Amino acid sequence: GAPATVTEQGEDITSKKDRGVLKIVKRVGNGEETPMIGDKVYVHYKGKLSNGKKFDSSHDRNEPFVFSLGKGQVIKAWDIGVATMKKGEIAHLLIKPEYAYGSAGSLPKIPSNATLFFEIELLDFKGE
Numbered sequence: 001g002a003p004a005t006v007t008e009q010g011e012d013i014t015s016k017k018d019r020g021v022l023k024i025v026k027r028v029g030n031g032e033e034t035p036m037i038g039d040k041v042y043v044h045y046k047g048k049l050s051n052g053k054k055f056d057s058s059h060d061r062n063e064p065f066v067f068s069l070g071k072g073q074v075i076k077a078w079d080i081g082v083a084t085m086k087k088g089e090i091a092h093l094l095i096k097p098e099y100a101y102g103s104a105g106s107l108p109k110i111p112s113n114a115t116l117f118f119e120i121e122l123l124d125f126k127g128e
């Protein structure tokens with residue numbers, strides 16, 4: 001499946017190279033620009049727990065997920081992984097707990113020490 005493909009062929013995009021955030025680009029975007037910290041970012045996403053017990057998509061809310069990059073409003077792995085994307089790009093991220101909800105989890109939504117998977121599409125980003 002998609003998460004196993006990410007384990008085996010995905011790029012380690014963490015600074016510490018501890019494989020905590022792995023990425024495959026699944027649809028290439030356009031332009032050279034990727035978002036800077038502080039930029040307003042609009043995405044669609046699907047996500048799941050590696051235990052298969054919970055799934056979440058922006059399309060449920062019928063509308064883009066909007067957030068300010070690097071402003072600690074999402075998990076570390078998103079600040080790291082969305083910053084690497086181009087406008088129009090679809091990527092797959094597989095994320096160890098240290099870059100998500102940690103040992104404590106976000107009980108009981110996110111269990112303790114959960115690995116997470118997302119499919120993210122970067123729709124647009126604007127200057128603060």
Ligand SMILES: COc1cc2cc(OC)c1OC[C@H](O)[C@@H](O)CCOC(=O)[C@@H]1CCCCN1C(=O)[C@H]2C1CCCCC1
Pocket residue numbers: 045047048049054055056065073074075078106109110116
């Ligand atoms: C722990 O709580 C949540 C987790 C997620 C979705 C939630 O609501 C839509 C949610 O509760 C509201 C909270 O406001 C979130 O924003 C926290 C930040 O969320 C993120 O940082 C990450 C990345 C941005 C998209 C949402 N995502 C999540 O962790 C989802 C998870 C994904 C795994 C499967 C369960 C939902």
